[PDB]
């Protein structure tokens, strides 16, 4: 959470840093897989497919 | 000028962007930030009925509808994502009721 920070330049943990650590991570996505964070949202992804040309 | 024989040939010289771009911008708009989308007002509405026809004369703390929002935005975020995997997988790009049916019957819910 406190990598997640400093990535995002802040000096307070917000759930959204939470969010990013847990997920990223592979083992503590697995350990928290049926538990959602307040304030968290998702990762940014998009598909291959969706993708222009 | 001057030449009548066999003459010299040479010598003489609103924007509109395409449907997908915005889409697109817009989703990554939405997968950086994490506040609430479904409008609060509405939604306490909404559940304050779900509620009445549970039992009669109930009162919700302001922090139960949010839990209840929090919970319930996460749940269609995430069938969302279940729901283009299965429209990506039917060689199409647009989500159909039949993907939503799809993902909820490999999930279980019945």
């Given at each position: 959470a406190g990598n997640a920070?400093?990535?995002?330049?802040?000096?307070?943990?917000?759930?959204?840093?939470?969010?990013?650590a847990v997920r990223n991570d592979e083992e503590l996505n697995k350990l928290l897989g049926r538990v959602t964070i307040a304030?968290?949202?998702?990762?940014?992804?998009?598909?291959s497919v969706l993708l222009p040309k | 000028t001057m030449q009548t024989a066999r003459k010299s040939t040479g010598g003489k010289a609103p924007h509109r962007y395409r449907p997908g771009t915005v889409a697109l911008r817009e989703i990554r708009r939405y997968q950086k930030s994490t506040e609430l989308l479904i409008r609060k007002l509405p939604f306490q509405r909404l559940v304050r009925e779900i509620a009445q026809d549970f039992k009669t004369d109930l009162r919700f703390q302001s922090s139960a509808v949010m839990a209840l929002q929090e919970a319930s935005e996460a749940?269609?975020?995430?069938?969302?994502?279940?729901?283009?995997?299965?429209?990506?997988?039917?060689?199409?790009?647009?989500?159909?009721?039949?993907?939503?049916?799809?993902?909820?019957?490999?999930?279980?819910?019945?």
């Open positions: 920070a400093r990535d995002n330049k802040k000096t307070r943990i917000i759930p959204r840093h939470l969010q990013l304030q968290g949202g998702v990762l940014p992804n998009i598909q | 749940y269609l975020v995430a069938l969302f994502e279940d729901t283009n995997l299965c429209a990506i997988h039917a060689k199409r790009v647009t989500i159909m009721p039949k993907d939503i049916q799809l993902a909820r019957r490999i999930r279980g819910e019945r």
